[PDB]
């Protein structure tokens, strides 16, 4: 019972706890070995949304306890009770139970293929797919970032386009003032070549608008694909999670029957 | 030592002897047509050369105008100034008519002729600030936000103050700002250094110049290592002026008159010795010792130095109760509710995703209530919930730094975040947030697979086209304020008396008090644990209950503060008085209090009060990166920390130089731009003459960015030979010669660069096309230090991981050295200056192990000879120079082995390991750093990144067969075991340094367990004896034997 206990992983240090408690929710729990015996004995760890709560199990006169409620004749004794009830009665701000015993030895899936070698081959399949997925994700994450900056360059260009157009409109305004202030004289020679200036000026304000428009039409084109990348990013993201989470369980059911810590890196 | 390329002199013995230059393109065509819009309404089009100065263009324009109709309606050319729209969409008046066409950043090739209003010309040379920042000042003038406009107005205090301190004993004070003394942390010279000195003395070489002078004059001296610059000057003048015609009295008199007309300068760079410190404390002096060099100083007239300092002359910028007493937060009789309205812009496949909801929580670093989501209502197809969410926390128990963290999610357990955003529940004026809010969200980062992200920045994402989520905060028919300090203090006095009268006891039994329970020096124990070793609830209750005893152990504070229930104003109010006069603590420890786990203003205020007391300009520029980064976790624009950093920056131009670049570096990162531009604006407005220098460095780097951009797109599938001509052609153009020629190196401003040596300039072989550049050192004693200065400019790699790692290395070296154990790291210079753009220090006389092996190794290629590195080294160091070359190599290699293992950098092989001629070994190109490439598997790797292959083992045991078993190797193993152990006693410092980097968008550092590698690698959960074995075990397994 005690070594099995289902939720007892013993010699896992502080890290592989939070790393096995990563991304579950509410009331999830599991028991640890304490780090020093110049410290305590076992550690109950809770989960309270992203925050990991650490509770000390003290073992003295055959008694196991958090504090003085030492009556609780076993490690395995003390836990059960609190899977049924709240910890709030021990200390106020602890209004959660141990309802989620998430520690299920991961024989739930993993295709139950007793092979070990076959289970390891799966491990490789999933781990490649993962990496394939992580790169697609990554490629996309970057396309997104470029496209964000390329949109905002297009926005300021649009602005600079408008600004330019103002300066030019202003310009053929400015002139009309001084231009049709001279048209009064008899000399229509000079007038002709004042019309030329005026007529360069307007077909230019035409060209410029033709160019801003052309760019607004590409801002939408971009804003489109930008939407697309986001769509596809959010579509990879959930797949990258369950692929990733099944790769944690295959790696567990392996190091459950026979460690071989070093052998694994061939399937990764 | 960036001084000498870390070149050791092994004999020397003291005891003997796309939108770049115009919108669309990178490089304007060498000939270009320009529209000149005349104030008479005409447009004349000039054919201009790309590099023509506005002075030339104007002159040509007003000669051409005479040919178009309406001439006499024009004034004199002198009466006018050009304006145009620039690439940031802003009309810019071009005052400096010596600027070149290709350098105005136009957009469209056109200029408008106007007569200048805004008549304060002076004030409008204010584009200078905007140029240095990379965004026009007028962008700020336009920002509606009251916080922003309050920061601009309120920060000026700091500016005026600093400007005061400088102009105090002017000019000496000014000199001291521009050229602060480069100085070690302690005067106590480490035992290994003292000992290159023969019972405490250095030979130094004081140089001097009279007429013209193409003659300079040595005066070799031999003085105690600890004798000040003034003494040293006296001694040179004394030497220089003794004569058979001057008696002894007369000599003493002449020395008095002269002693203080002079100051000491390092020959070859811009480093001076302007204050009383033991000579040994100046970093140059100490470098020279280590390197086996004779210091070369120069005697400089104080006047000719004061001469090169100009008046900084600061100008205050143009931009020069409440709701009738308001209502206190602690009066609102209700729980908290927030109404979630709708999202707009969610991008999702109705096919791939079932449903979406808003996940929310209230947070202070980690969270103060039951977390809670709204129902999965009208999912994907137009997202509308119209729910009040109900949090169980009373409004009076909200702490000053309370945040809301929300995220939009997908959904047997599909739980997946789409986008995320955080809001401060109070604003910069202490106002509880009420009414309606539009929050633009952030995209789920690389790493984070969590559901909520409370580390992320507080505020709306400034991309318009993002998931915008509308929100509604309650209304209590008044604006609500966070209580006064004096109000909180009474509440604490009350709480205290009130405890003193209970009798029952629960968990947080706040009850012996009167004595200590003595074995209850669990407290001194908890105190020593690193910050990453989670605290358990029993301990949390415990530290709380003995809060008053904790004042006895000041450095227990980080842990106390995490034992507080921040959802309890009773508890928080008490903590406030406790902090109010906690003993200040060493800065290596205060700095944790400025990471993302400690957002309270009172706590951070404390931290800064620690730094204000203890942090020295030496140790501040060592941690300047972490300090800048931490600004991201400050809640508001105006905070005590920015005031502190800013006031140092404007008070010490070496700190300010790097403050500028670190900020400027991250200006693209939209999560920090607005904050950092604002900060940069203050700085630039008040730094004084240095602005002109920055503007030059900035002009250079834009030229380098724009040039490499052309190479990287559009000049590949070209041979190096073709690329190189293009390169050289371009640097020959006048605009480039001008931009890139006389300026300070951003890697170390003490290094002038001027006069490019194009023949020594190349594109290195890398696919990112880095530029190897080489500049004449223009100093009058170049010779005496280094004639040529070479740095690498690289465009394409994110330099800041390297940057961090080198900084870690530097800090490791110091810890080892200053504890008297001599391991020689070579943390070369690296500076990120942009988005994936940077400068790497070049190190002369270093070769990849791979090259060493390629140069020596016989005719027909078959197997590589293991002895050749050793051969190569023997050849470079014949004699008894040898024994010390093998010692340097043994030592550096030992250092770069422990640091490597601890940090878990990328695998070391023959071309990321480098050797120097003096036999110094150093790593380059680190890859990732905390075994980041275990984002896949990893699971208890703890890899040995630096494996000593035979090659290295040979060298270490001078040339033995079966090196595993020699004395030298025992010697080595001892340095290793000693260094590992040394760095382990400083683990807190290292963890804290990584913590403060969670900000920076560094994929390798996203969460505190990205950082947890370090605990494994340094065996923090074990006793040190066990750790030694762990370390040996680790080394034993990678080498297959040797370590027992």
Curated annotation (Swiss-Prot), chain A:
Transmembrane domains' residue ranges: none
Tissue specificity note: Isoform 2 is expressed in skeletal muscle and brain, and at lower levels in kidney and cardiac muscle. Isoform 2 and isoform 4 are present in skeletal muscle (at protein level).
Ranges where the SH2 domain occurs: 7-102
Superkingdom of the source species: Eukaryota
Gene Ontology BP annotations: B cell differentiation; cellular response to insulin stimulus; cellular response to UV; cytokine-mediated signaling pathway; extrinsic apoptotic signaling pathway via death domain receptors; growth hormone receptor signaling pathway; immune response; insulin receptor signaling pathway
Purpose of the protein: Binds to activated (phosphorylated) protein-Tyr kinases, through its SH2 domain, and acts as an adapter, mediating the association of the p110 catalytic unit to the plasma membrane. Necessary for the insulin-stimulated increase in glucose uptake and glycogen synthesis in insulin-sensitive tissues. Plays an important role in signaling in response to FGFR1, FGFR2, FGFR3, FGFR4, KITLG/SCF, KIT, PDGFRA and PDGFRB. Likewise, plays a role in ITGB2 signaling.
Name listed for the protein in its UniProt record: Phosphatidylinositol 3-kinase regulatory subunit alpha
Full-protein positions shown: 327 to 598 of 724
From Swiss-Prot, chain B:
C2 PI3K-type domain sequence ranges: 332-483
Keyword Kinase: yes
Annotated region described as G-loop, given as residue ranges: 763-769
EC number: 2.7.1.137, 2.7.1.153, 2.7.11.1
Consequence when changing residue 538 to K: In OC; uncertain significance
Result after altering residue 1039 to Y: In MCAP; also found in an endometrial carcinoma sample
Effect recorded for residue 538 to P: Found in an anaplastic astrocytoma sample; uncertain significance
Domain PI3K/PI4K catalytic, chain residue ranges per copy: 757-1043
Outcome of mutating residue 534 to K: In CLOVE, KERSEB, CRC, BC, CLAPO, MADAC, CCM4 and HFMH; somatic mutation; also found in glioblastoma multiforme and endometrial carcinoma; somatic mutation; shows an increase in lipid kinase activity; oncogenic in vivo; occurs in the interface between the PI3K helical domain and the nSH2 (N-terminal SH2) region of the p85 regulatory subunit and may reduce the inhibitory effect of p85; requires interaction with RAS to induce cellular transformation; increased AKT and RPS6 phosphorylation in HFMH patient's cells
Record's function text: Phosphoinositide-3-kinase (PI3K) phosphorylates phosphatidylinositol (PI) and its phosphorylated derivatives at position 3 of the inositol ring to produce 3-phosphoinositides. Uses ATP and PtdIns(4,5)P2 (phosphatidylinositol 4,5-bisphosphate) to generate phosphatidylinositol 3,4,5-trisphosphate (PIP3). PIP3 plays a key role by recruiting PH domain-containing proteins to the membrane, including AKT1 and PDPK1, activating signaling cascades involved in cell growth, survival, proliferation, motility and morphology. Participates in cellular signaling in response to various growth factors.
UniProt name for this protein: Phosphatidylinositol 4,5-bisphosphate 3-kinase catalytic subunit alpha isoform
Lineage summary: Eukaryota, Metazoa, Chordata, Craniata, Vertebrata
